[PDB]
Amino acid sequence: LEASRAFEVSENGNLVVSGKVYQWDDPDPRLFDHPESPTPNPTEPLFLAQAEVYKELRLRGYDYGPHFQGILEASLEGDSGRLLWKDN
């Protein structure tokens, strides 16, 4: 509904998702600058490799397969990491 800028995803006449979507008239790169970490902890001697992080996730109940394993690393506290990019 472009006039009211609202969308709706319907599966066989039954709603699934709803919200508002519109074009970003004046994009600003400043929004994507990384906010400072509340806890400095500059050392970070250790980190969770991909295998360890997904072991934790599966222990909790998430069973992501290879195509959705995108975390190459993540700090122990879990506030920063590196995400793989594969055009998806």
Residues paired with residue 59 on neighbouring β-strands, in sequence order: none
Asked whether the beta carbons of 61 and 54 are under 8 A apart, the reply is no
Give the x/- contact pattern for a second copy in 32-61, rule: CB under 8 A: ---xx-x-----------------------
> Do the Cβ atoms of 47 and 38 come closer than 8 Å?
no
Write the binding mask 6 to 25 for a second copy: x where contact by CB under 8 A, - elsewhere: x-x-x--xxx--x-------
- Token pair recorded at residue 2: 């472009």
Q: Which residues bind a second copy (CB under 8 A)?
A: 1-4, 6, 8, 10, 13-15, 18, 35-36, 38
